[model samples]
Target: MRKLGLIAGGGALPVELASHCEAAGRAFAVMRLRSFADPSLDRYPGADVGIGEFGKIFKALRAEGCDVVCFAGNVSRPDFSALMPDARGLKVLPSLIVAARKGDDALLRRVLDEFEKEGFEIEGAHEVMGEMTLPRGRLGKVSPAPEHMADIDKALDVAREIGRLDIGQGAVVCEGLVLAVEAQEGTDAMLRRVADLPEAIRGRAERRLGVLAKAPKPIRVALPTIGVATIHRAARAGLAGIVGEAGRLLVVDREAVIAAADDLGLFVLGVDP
Candidate 1:
């Protein structure tokens, strides 16, 4: 019976969140992030979907009585190299990118602040649907082998190190060696890059790869990286497991990705979720 706002982005999480709102008998409106959030979102009953420039997101959502808004979906890291900004968005541009270590948090927080100034209460989506934030542990029938666990430990360390440099949030591991580090290019491409590595080492047989560890810089502004579709892509890359912060991470198409992980016998776990 609660009314909520979903600032939808790219991937299945927005749709998943919408269905949960419908089931709870809550009235929720959605605004899809242009070029990032999926366009298919226009179909949900009462789904107030809009897509355009960042300058207009607040107007569209605010008009729909979305006082409490939850941002769900993956918006790619902005390519600030060339730098294009609208006059409205550009006014606050310097404050937006000053802290390289904060990642997306500063910009997102500014946007949220704008919403707050407009008298909207920025609430987490988890308030309406608690299960959206997963827990820290194995969610299915698989787990990391002891050897793979060792690799996860190593990968986790590397991800944190890379994150400190504002390099990226992910690392692919195998036998305690770092395979790939995610950059602005994103996770899927990073995984595929790992898959292309030469398979020269030997094991009991042809050893499968280990885990993909993704973590948010302890201070990332927008949200932590890593999700379910990311896990599926890891599986496709022949990894045996995935480890990420549980509740802090977003899993797109949770059911389908979980099913995919289960079918592939890949272990999925989180540090916090």
Candidate 2:
């Protein structure tokens, strides 16, 4: 079997990808990011490495004869805020600084560059897992209510505007107005903020929430991973549905996500773009 390096980050995405890679006959060795991986996956067989040691990680993969790597799961933005450099992270900091400080896409492109520089090819997580990168449209039994369709349209426009400003990828479209937009605080916080918007947006006419939308920055280099925390918050917020870019947004645990959305009678769709 050919060996594939798995740079596992936080959430169920890593685990899901591992299952597919295994089924596809790829050797699954991992450099699990400490900040985000579930402790449970540690029980499984894999080469474990810390996030700080990029050089060792590359060397280990090379020694094992792995040439392709796939990155999955969520890495908190705050986690990277500190400039504590490991030997490898430090060595690559100059070029990394230029790309990363610009935006997420730029940072990811540089990350690919770093890996490529080390003589490894980076592959999309979807190559191993089919449903992991979902197609655009409804995934389960539920469809977006009429109100949600409107919210989706309105939200898409504003979400792109926010993207243009390099704000964030998500927006809550309750009724017709924009409730809240995601930022460095992350999606869970943004959901809560949207849930509380009724109190803040007083004097506005009565309007119930319809759906939520998240997408790439429009010029994406690598696919993004979203997790249960986001779905849980949306369920808690009583959202009608969620929409994201198909094949671009990584939806962790599709069954669980669908169950949660079903319980809330929330429809989930992915944008074709």
What number of clashing residue pairs does each candidate have, in the order they appear? 9, 1
Clashes of 2: 1
> How far in Å is the alpha carbon of 225 misplaced in model 1?
5.3
Quote each prediction's TM-score: 0.80, 0.84
Give one digit per residue, the lDDT tens place, for model 2 in 1-273.
Answer: 245777777766677767776686666777766666777568454556666566777777887667887776676443455534358767876676677678766666676778888878676544544666667788778887665678888777777777766678888776776777877877888877766665444112233355678877875335545556666677666677778777777777778877776765667788777
Give the top-scoring candidate (lDDT). Answer: 2
Per-residue lDDT of candidate 1, residues 1-273 (tens digit) = 236777777776677677677676657777766556666787553333333245556666666676677777776546566544445555555565664346654555666666666667666645623665556888667777776878878888888888776678788777777778887778888877766677643121135567888876664224455556676667667788877776666555567667878877787787752
How far does residue 157 in candidate 2 sit from its true spot (Å)? 2.1
The alpha-carbon lDDT assigned to residue 250 of candidate 2 equals: 73
lDDT of 1 at 10: 73
> What is the TM-score (0 to 1) of candidate 1?
0.80
Error of 2 at 13 (Å): 1.4
For each candidate in the order shown, give its overall lDDT on alpha carbons.
Answer: 0.66, 0.68
